[PDB]
Amino acid sequence: KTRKESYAIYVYKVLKQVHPDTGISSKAMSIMNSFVNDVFERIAGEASRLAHYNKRSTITSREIQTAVRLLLPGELAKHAVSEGTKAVTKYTSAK
């Protein structure tokens, strides 16, 4: 009865954060799930290429960062880069 993962509960959490009285249809959720997978693949992909081009066998938060800059448009990138730097810094100082 195989297990099919999605990003649904997580999309829902964030949803409640930004619009506490708004719901989401399962088809909308599905699309949401597709979008996350999509962007995941595009970032990971560039990251993958980027590493190769530099004869590196490790994908680090630095690779992801250039990937985000290469992939996302102007203002989305700027803000994504903050949020990720932030998360790492916070993650580094937390063990």
Binding site: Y10, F35, S61, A87
Partner: protein
């Protein structure tokens, strides 16, 4: 016993994203910052779109975001529109847009 997600102050699952990076054959190794940074970008992007879709839902006297609202959100936002410029949101329709010369009289 604290999850890395909470350690990074994130809703999105860092564990899962670390895993999918390995399984997905992107490089030999995956650094520990990688999935944190990515999950963060992933969470940020989804917030940005839900914020905007939420607004379209409200503009429409609806409480539940449906595919049309996501489409309104994406298409109305220059940057999300570029990011998703070669993507089709099933059941989203199009933005109302009639070319000038098409309207009656003068």
């Amino acid at each position: 016993a604290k999850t890395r997600s909470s350690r990074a102050g994130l809703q999105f699952p860092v564990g899962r994203v670390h895993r999918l990076l390995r399984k997905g054959n992107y490089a030999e190794r995956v650094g520990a910052g990688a999935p944190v940074y990515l999950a963060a970008v992933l969470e940020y992007l989804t917030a940005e779109i839900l914020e905007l879709a939420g607004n379209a839902a409200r503009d429409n006297k609806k409480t539940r975001i449906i595919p049309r609202h996501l489409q309104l959100a994406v298409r109305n936002d220059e940057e999300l529109n570029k990011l998703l410029g070669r993507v089709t949101i099933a059941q989203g329709g199009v933005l109302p847009n009639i070319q000038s010369v098409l309207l009656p009289k003068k």
